Amino acid sequence: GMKLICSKANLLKGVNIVSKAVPTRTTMAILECILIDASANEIKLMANDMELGIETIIDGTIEERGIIALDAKIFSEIVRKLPDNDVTIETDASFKTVISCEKAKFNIIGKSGDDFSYIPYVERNESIVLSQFTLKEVIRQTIFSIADNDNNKLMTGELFEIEENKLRVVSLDGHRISIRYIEMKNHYDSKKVVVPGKTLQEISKIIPGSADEDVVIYITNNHIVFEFENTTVVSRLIEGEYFKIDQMLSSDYDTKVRINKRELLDCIDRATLLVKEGDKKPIIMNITDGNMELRINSFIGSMNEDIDIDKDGKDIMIGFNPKFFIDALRVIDEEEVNLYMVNPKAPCFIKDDEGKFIYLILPVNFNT
């Protein structure tokens, strides 16, 4: 049976990384485990839910080569509560596992690694490099508008599109579209894939986000691979033709509004206090020369607010789900934003001067 010695801090960092691929609630028991693979010359921790696989290398000494699967919850809680010293992990043929550190000892029962579905081999072709910061930020800037249900599988993921030195990240749920553009310093072959939402959410939790550290990405047909520090994230891709959205990014508008981003965000956020879970009231905007008036009313009461704007084009009254504006404005760093509208039934676009983003929000249909 297996025998290893690891520093607690290295083992803790590792279990905390691979745990993001351990299913929250499942009927599959081996999926609730972390695999310890010490069969070769490296200590490898692994978690796989069949969609998302996470692998990490732990620094340590292999005294006796071996493999074991341990309950992810019990093993992480053990590692997290052990003293800050060397941790010994020892197993036997009956899968009885002893985890020892200083004068403390835990006896638990593991499972055979033969039941564990290993992360598949993925051929590494062309590599894409992004800073940890850029990847974490582009997910934060788009992840909120993926669908909250499984009615359409493609809507539960994010489109990743590369053409020459440009990357475009897209999410949509049928009510809005979030698009981010990134100019890269390298030229790459064209690629268009849909990454599951859960993959991007879980990778957000393990990527520190330094602007000085990089992520190497591989897109090989049915899989996406992310490498950073001593971790490998492998994810299945969503199959099918993604929505044709370039047709909807019609550059024609009848109204353009320049407004302070923080004032708009604070006002829409104020309005939401009047509408609670059992209510679904739109925020009404009345855009005139130099002014935007926002209203909401409910059983709790009403709100009226005026915001100074710079408006070009037609006066317009338009309604929206406040949540959609709050989600997009929360991820816009710019001091001011440009709102583009055609009419009260047409989409509204939040765009910037530098071409970094497009947030499309569908308004409320009042049916005239």
Do 74 and 108 form a contact (C-beta atoms < 8 A)? Answer: yes
Do 233 and 203 form a contact (C-beta atoms < 8 A)? Answer: yes
Which of Cl ion, a second copy, none has residue 25 at its interface (CB below 5 to 8 Å by kind)?
A: none
Three-state DSSP class for residue 365: coil
Which of Cl ion, a second copy, none has residue 77 at its interface (CB below 5 to 8 Å by kind)?
A: a second copy
| Residue 342 Cβ vs a second copy, minimum distance, rounded to whole Å | 27
Interface region with a second copy, contact rule CB under 8 A, candidates 7-15, 40-48, 103-111, 326-334:
103-111
- Phi, psi dihedral angles at 352 (to 5 degrees): -115, 165
355/332 Cα distance (integer angstroms): 13
204 part of the interface to Cl ion, by CB under 5 A: no
Interface region with a second copy, contact rule CB under 8 A, candidates 128-136, 181-189, 208-216, 303-311:
303-311
Among 122, 169, 318, 358, binds Cl ion (CB under 5 A): 122
Cβ partners under 8 Å of residue 247, min gap 6 = none
| Residue 306 Cβ vs a second copy, minimum distance, rounded to whole Å | 4
217 part of the interface to Cl ion, by CB under 5 A: no
The gap from C-alpha 63 to its chain's centroid, in whole angstroms, comes to 39
Between 213 and 306, name the residue whose CB sits nearer to a second copy.
Answer: 306
Name residue, tokens 């990527």. Answer: 207
| Residue 123 Cβ vs Cl ion, minimum distance, rounded to whole Å | 9
Interface region with a second copy, contact rule CB under 8 A, candidates 5-13, 230-238, 304-312, 332-340:
304-312
Pairing of strands 60-64, 3-7: antiparallel
Do 43 and 223 form a contact (C-beta atoms < 8 A)? Answer: no
| Residue 341 Cβ vs Cl ion, minimum distance, rounded to whole Å | 42
34 part of the interface to a second copy, by CB under 8 A: no
- Phi, psi dihedral angles at 97 (to 5 degrees): -120, 130
Among 7, 16, 131, 297, binds Cl ion (CB under 5 A): 16
288 part of the interface to a second copy, by CB under 8 A: no
| Residue 4 Cβ vs a second copy, minimum distance, rounded to whole Å | 18
Phi-psi region of 209 (alpha: psi -120 to 50; beta: other; left: phi over 0): left
| Residue 46 Cβ vs a second copy, minimum distance, rounded to whole Å | 22
Q: Which long-range contacts does 165-169 make (Cβ < 8 Å, 24+ apart)?
A: 167/128, 167/130, 167/138, 169/138, 169/139, 169/141, 169/142
305 part of the interface to a second copy, by CB under 8 A: yes
Interface region with a second copy, contact rule CB under 8 A, candidates 14-22, 28-36, 107-115, 137-145:
107-115
Among 26, 302, 343, 365, binds a second copy (CB under 8 A): 302
Report the site for a second copy in 261-280 (rule: CB under 8 A): 266-267, 269-270, 273-274
Q: How many CB atoms lie within 10 A of CB 235?
A: 26
Cβ partners under 8 Å of residue 178, min gap 6 = 141, 142, 144, 145, 170, 171, 172, 328, 357, 358, 359, 360
Site map (CB under 8 A) of a second copy, residues 70-89, x = contact: ----x--xx--xxx------
| Residue 191 Cβ vs a second copy, minimum distance, rounded to whole Å | 43
Task: Give the bridge partners for 86, in sequence order.
Answer: 7
Task: By CB under 5 A, name the binding residues for Cl ion.
Answer: 16, 122, 206
Task: By CB under 8 A, name the binding residues for a second copy.
Answer: 74, 77-78, 81-83, 103-109, 266-267, 269-270, 273-274, 300-307
